[PDB]
Amino acid sequence: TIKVFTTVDNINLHTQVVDMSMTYGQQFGPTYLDGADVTKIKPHNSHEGKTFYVLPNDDTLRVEAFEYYHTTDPSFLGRYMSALNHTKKWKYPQVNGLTSIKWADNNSYLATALLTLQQIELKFNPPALQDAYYRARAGEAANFCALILAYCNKTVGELGDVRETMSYLFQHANLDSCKRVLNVVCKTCGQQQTTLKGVEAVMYMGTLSYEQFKKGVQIPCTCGKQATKYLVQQESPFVMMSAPPAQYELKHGTFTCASEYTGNYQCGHYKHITSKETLYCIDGALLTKSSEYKGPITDVFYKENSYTTTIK
Ligand SMILES: Cn1c(=O)c2c(ncn2C)n(C)c1=O
Numbered sequence: 001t002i003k004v005f006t007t008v009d010n011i012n013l014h015t016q017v018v019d020m021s022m023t024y025g026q027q028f029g030p031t032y033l034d035g036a037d038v039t040k041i042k043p044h045n046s047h048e049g050k051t052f053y054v055l056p057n058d059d060t061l062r063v064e065a066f067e068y069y070h071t072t073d074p075s076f077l078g079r080y081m082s083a084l085n086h087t088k089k090w091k092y093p094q095v096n097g098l099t100s101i102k103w104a105d106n107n108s109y110l111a112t113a114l115l116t117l118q119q120i121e122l123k124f125n126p127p128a129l130q131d132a133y134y135r136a137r138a139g140e141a142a143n144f145c146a147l148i149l150a151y152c153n154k155t156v157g158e159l160g161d162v163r164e165t166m167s168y169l170f171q172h173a174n175l176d177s178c179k180r181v182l183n184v185v186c187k188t189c190g191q192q193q194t195t196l197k198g199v200e201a202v203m204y205m206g207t208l209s210y211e212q213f214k215k216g217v218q219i220p221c222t223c224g225k226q227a228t229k230y231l232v233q234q235e236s237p238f239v240m241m242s243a244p245p246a247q248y249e250l251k252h253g254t255f256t257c258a259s260e261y262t263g264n265y266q267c268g269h270y271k272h273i274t275s276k277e278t279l280y281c282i283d284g285a286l287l288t289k290s291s292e293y294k295g296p297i298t299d300v301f302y303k304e305n306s307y308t309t310t311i312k
């Protein structure tokens with residue numbers, strides 16, 4: 001017999017005596033050793049003392065799992081392991097001071113999401129995610145990428161959407177106190193103010209221009225006229241403005257960073273544009289600098305703190 005540790009978080013370890021005549025799966029359920037699936041394997045003597053991950057299959061492990069990952073989805077950990085086997089083999093070059101990802105397995109959407117996160121102010125609430133995120137910021141991003149895939153219910157190689165991805169991640173970020181107040185004005189129906197909080201206060205779908213959002217965008221009214229919607233008040237460290245991809249000119253110094261999307265739902269590619277002393281296009285491991293940029297932009301990120309309209 002051998003003594004080992006089992007765990008769901010590699011924080012709380014639990015002693016186990018292992019029967020060498022049974023596989024790990026027969027004793028523990030699906031079981032991983034340093035990420036390798038050992039479910040169908042007989043214990044080796046050399047495994048004595050090692051730490052194994054298992055699926056949360058009792059109350060203690062379930063609570064520990066929830067406390068570390070902030071999800072009760074029982075398939076989460078298996079999904080994470082499957083992703084991590086791949087993301088450990090990706091490469092994470094430093095590009096223009098940021099951790100990027102060299103292209104692999106259609107991962108451009110994860111690269112531009114990671115590049116974006118390093119330019120906006122945000123903290124993740126699940127300890128697993130915030131821990132992985134700080135390692136990713138330093139260049140060791142495999143765990144962070146596998147968690148993102150797991151949180152988004154995506155597998156390695158699946159095409160992804162940055163906006164959807166950002167939405168899921170923001171739901172695990174402390175945006176609780178972010179606030180947006182909007183006003184919609186119809187000459188017939190009058191004015192209707194709305195207040196949004198959390199993730200809905202920092203994401204908008206329909207226009208890339210933050211300035212246009214402040215000035216007012218035309219939206220239809222059920223009465224049949226065109227109403228105007230504009231931003232009354234914003235309280236957040238950034239905003240995300242998105243729209244269906246379309247040719248768009250990005251101007252140095254008017255935005256923080258942006259996502260460009262080429263292709264369709266069957267085959268496509270993201271690039272990342274950032275505004276520094278000039279414009280930089282980060283494309284996985286590739287870097288290109290230019291003073292102007294035009295492309296099929298789909299998300300633009302802007303810094304914010306507090307904004308109040310002067311529209312009376
Ligand atoms: C996979 N892939 C694409 O699919 C792609 C692209 N540029 C345009 N497209 C569509 N690049 C650079 C790419 O690596």
Ligand SMILES: [Zn+2]
Pocket residue numbers: 186187188189190221222223224225227
């Ligand atoms: Zn109306």
